[model samples]
Target: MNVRLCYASQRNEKNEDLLQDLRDILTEARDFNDLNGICGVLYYADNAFFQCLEGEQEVVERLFEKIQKDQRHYNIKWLCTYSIDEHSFQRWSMKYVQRNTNIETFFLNMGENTFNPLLLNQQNLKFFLNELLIAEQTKMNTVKKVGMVNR
Candidate 1:
């Protein structure tokens, strides 16, 4: 059975320096995915990361254990998670998707701070997840509608 693990975290001061750091992490993750068979996407907002990782239960669990230990961010919070009936992304292979521009806008509204809360709240995190689900559903509907028209 495929398992999906979700974790949330807000980047520390180095979030501004994430451009290069994220690229490096993705590089390593991509190589690891190639070696194994894992896939997922990451969403960022307010310097917080909401990532969904899907793969073999053991592999996903093990990798995330290391992820929690990595110094990539701070105040790591594990949100609610459970076994899904099926994987939202089982065959596409590993990938990453930025959550939304609204998230960036929200962060920018706050602007730079020497210290910002690095922990996310359950209510807010769930709201963000819901938005992502709606966005993905809309995208799928659009794709399906286009296919119907063409056919």
Candidate 2:
């Protein structure tokens, strides 16, 4: 009844407020994603961003449409999209994590020294997201409906 969609985008290097932009993204997504039953991980490294969103087909696709129009990044491209059933990863919340050296090593392991996700193949894309799930599984904090303010 749910689907998983992952995509990558290149950062707008000219933006004067990249730091603020990232915070806003995480904060906004933390709220919106929870409200709609979405689970995902957002990863940023080397001026690129990679994210995996899992939720109801309509909900996830609906959000991806809005993402396509977001200007914070360019060259939006899909890594993978597939219908899923049973035992969804079930992180049950949106998450943002600090980067690890493994991201760069992942690129190198793929035989690409640069960090351009646009060049990643379908298999590699899903493989990378799984890595994030394993690494961040322990870090996730499931939250029920709440507010933007501290509880």
Candidate 3:
């Protein structure tokens, strides 16, 4: 069975001003995830990160263990862990979505200005993430179309 994990962590000071650092992390994550048969999505906002990962039970667990030790971030709070029949984010090895300051408004009932995984249940998290995936896909498609039109 495949396992999916969602977690949140605070961004360290070293990465506070560095968008490139986050890009580097995502690039490396995509490569590593591709090699290990893993898939996931990453979101960052308000100096915090929310990530969801899915893959083989052992492989996912092993990757999470390594992430916990990584110095780029701290206070890793695991939001949820469960088995899934199919990967929710199967299309991307490590999709990166940068959430803006107004992200809290996106959560239907959560009425807050910041993200706290503890307050959001698994169901809502999945719904929100799926919505994010759709939006990201739409944005990419638009970019591709614009490029083609300009060519």
Candidate 4:
């Protein structure tokens, strides 16, 4: 499967409606997956958009195109559209999330303050998102391995 990842900033006035529209997309994506075995996720907040779509190569590409044409945002930045051997977030059709402060801090520590023009580009976006994904998965793995003993 190939994965499509993208990021952008939405117009401020459209944020609420856009978020609701995205939630609808998330719901629809799940049904699409159940019927066809594909998965995807959309994340947005404070006028920013980040998304990941994973499925067959062609389907993911088509979805990415649709998202790029979505009219709610100006200054849309397409970070990267590349292939991955497996799905990253298979459990979500449209999983909405706000990155925790720690995760945000990690990006800053890595010099990926995304809105900064100097660091905002395909390579930087890819690097930042990939690292965040790995970190999130690692945290999940740790939780699984430790079995929530202390909690």
In model 3, state the lDDT of residue 40: 89
Residue pairs with colliding backbones in model 1 are none
Q: Cα lDDT of model 1 overall? A: 0.59
Clash counts per candidate, in order, are: 0, 0, 0, 0
Query: In model 3, which runs have C-alpha deviations exceeding 4 angstroms?
Result: 100-104, 115-119, 137-151
Point out the higher-scoring one by TM-score: 3 or 4.
Answer: 3
lDDT of 4 by residue, 1-151 (tens): 5565555555446445654555444455555565655665554545565666666777767666666675665666666667776666676554555465655665577777643322356765545455445443211111222223334
Candidate 3, residues 70-94, lDDT tens digits: the string is 8788988888888987777899888
The candidate with the higher lDDT, 2 or 4, is 2
Compared with the true structure, all predictions reach lDDT values of 0.59, 0.74, 0.73, 0.54
State residue 110's C-alpha deviation in candidate 3, in Å.
2.1
- In angstroms, the error of model 4 at 5 is 3.8
Model 2 ranges with Cα > 4 A deviation: 85-89, 136-151
User: Model 1, residue 64: displacement in angstroms?
Assistant: 0.8
Residue runs of model 1 more than 4 Å from their true location after superposition: 14-16, 99-151
Candidate 2 residue lDDT tens string, 54-76: 98989999999998888888888
Clashes of 3: 0
lDDT of 1 by residue, 25-144 (tens): 566665676567887666554566667777788888888888888777777777655666666655434444464555444444556332222343555555444444434321111221
The candidate maximizing lDDT is: 2
